[PDB]
Design a protein around this ligand. Structure first.
Ligand code: DZA
Ligand code: DZA
Ligand code: CL
Ligand code: NI
Ligand code: ZN
Length: 348
């Protein structure tokens, strides 16, 4: 399904929305994973929070100033940690005439201004803030407790990895970016825009992921030479015009307040925020993910880089391959077009 591998949008009914793992299995049966990214608009009647009016006190312990250097569509982003600040302090900086959204008529225009001005007037991103904005009673798509098999890490080793099996919050402002990357251990990820201006996304089909990597390696040989997974440093920006010029397939989509974005295993993506907004996200998994976990190329140059032990997963979900895998002889080749097993029932 989905032979063009374009980003799909879904509209679950409340009945469909209730079972998260089941709906993820559903959209995959429709080919949604092929684009590496998919949007899910929740039923009009759902809401994770009554109001977002008491958080002006929330502290953003580590805001980041995003300095970007580059030319001709190729850039490197340097984060500079600023002193803690609360939301109030952030919104005002964000809406001030110095950092606010430019005037525009269409998205094509804002996109152009982004790529033309990303190296100028470095903005601040209140990123990676531990926490959730969900009310403790919301049981549908609660990013704080999705109950997928990824819980097996916490559940067998008590190991929690901030932002991975725990929720993160991001407060952005015009021009703040997320560099090209796949998730840690090439996991899935879910992102919910709580409020504010839109966030635009770019994505490359998992099946064409290696092509993006060769492109990046070609443009940054030094970086490539010292880390086998330098894109995991989340510092590399490449414009759609460069992607188009070198033949890399990609699609773009704009997520609005109240919408979810799901990224799939080995799906490269990047993007930027339109203005002041707040988003929440975490990582999750399905059975199809295990093979990806086992074959993910990891960052070989830093410390505290996320490394999940695939052992408990192979043991429990692939008992017949455990011995071969342990011996380093498991040579399964991943087929990026195959939906996850849990999708069987929608393919009857
Ligand atoms: C988890 N991942 C899909 N989320 C993103 O890449 C967006 C992060 C951001 O909003 O800066
Ligand atoms: C129930 N939900 C998970 N799935 C759907 O509504 C789609 C069912 C189908 O495959 O037509
Ligand atoms: Cl280089
Ligand atoms: Ni991501
Ligand atoms: Zn590295």
């Amino acid at each position: 399904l989905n032979p063009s591998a374009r980003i799909m949008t879904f509209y679950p009914t409340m009945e469909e929305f209730r079972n998260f793992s089941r709906y993820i299995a559903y959209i995959e049966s429709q080919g949604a994973h092929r684009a590496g990214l998919a949007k899910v608009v929740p039923p009009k009647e759902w809401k994770p929070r009554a109001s977002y009016d008491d958080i002006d006190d929330l502290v953003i312990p580590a805001p980041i100033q995003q300095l970007v250097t580059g030319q001709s569509g190729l850039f490197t982003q340097y984060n500079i940690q600023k002193k803690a600040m609360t939301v109030r302090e952030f919104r005002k900086i964000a809406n001030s005439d110095k950092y606010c959204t430019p005037r525009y008529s269409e998205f094509e225009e804002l996109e152009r201004k982004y790529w033309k001005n990303l190296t100028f007037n470095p903005p601040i991103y209140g990123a990676d803030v531990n926490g959730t904005l969900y009310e403790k009673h919301v049981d549908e798509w609660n990013i704080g407790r999705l109950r997928t098999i990824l819980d097996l890490v916490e559940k067998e080793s008590g190991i929690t990895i901030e932002g991975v099996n725990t929720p993160y919050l991001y407060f952005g402002m015009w021009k703040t970016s997320f560099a090209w990357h796949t998730e840690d251990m090439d996991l899935y990820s879910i992102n919910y825009l709580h409020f504010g201006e839109p966030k635009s996304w770019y994505s490359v089909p998992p099946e064409h992921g290696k092509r993006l990597e060769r492109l990046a390696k070609g443009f940054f040989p030094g970086s490539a030479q010292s880390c086998e997974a330098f894109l995991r440093h989340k510092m590399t920006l490449i414009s759609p015009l460069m992607l188009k010029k070198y033949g890399i397939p990609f699609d773009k989509v704009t997520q609005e307040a109240g919408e979810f974005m799901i990224t799939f295993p080995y799906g490269y993506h990047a993007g930027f925020n339109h203005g002041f907004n707040c988003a929440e996200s975490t990582n999750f998994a399905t059975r199809r993910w295990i093979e990806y976990g086992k074959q993910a190329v990891l960052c070989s140059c830093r410390k505290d880089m996320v490394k999940i032990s695939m052992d408990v997963f192979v043991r429990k979900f692939q008992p017949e391959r455990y011995k071969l895998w342990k011996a380093g002889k498991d040579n399964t080749v991943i087929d990026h077009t195959l939906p996850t097993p849990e999708a069987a029932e929608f393919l009857k």
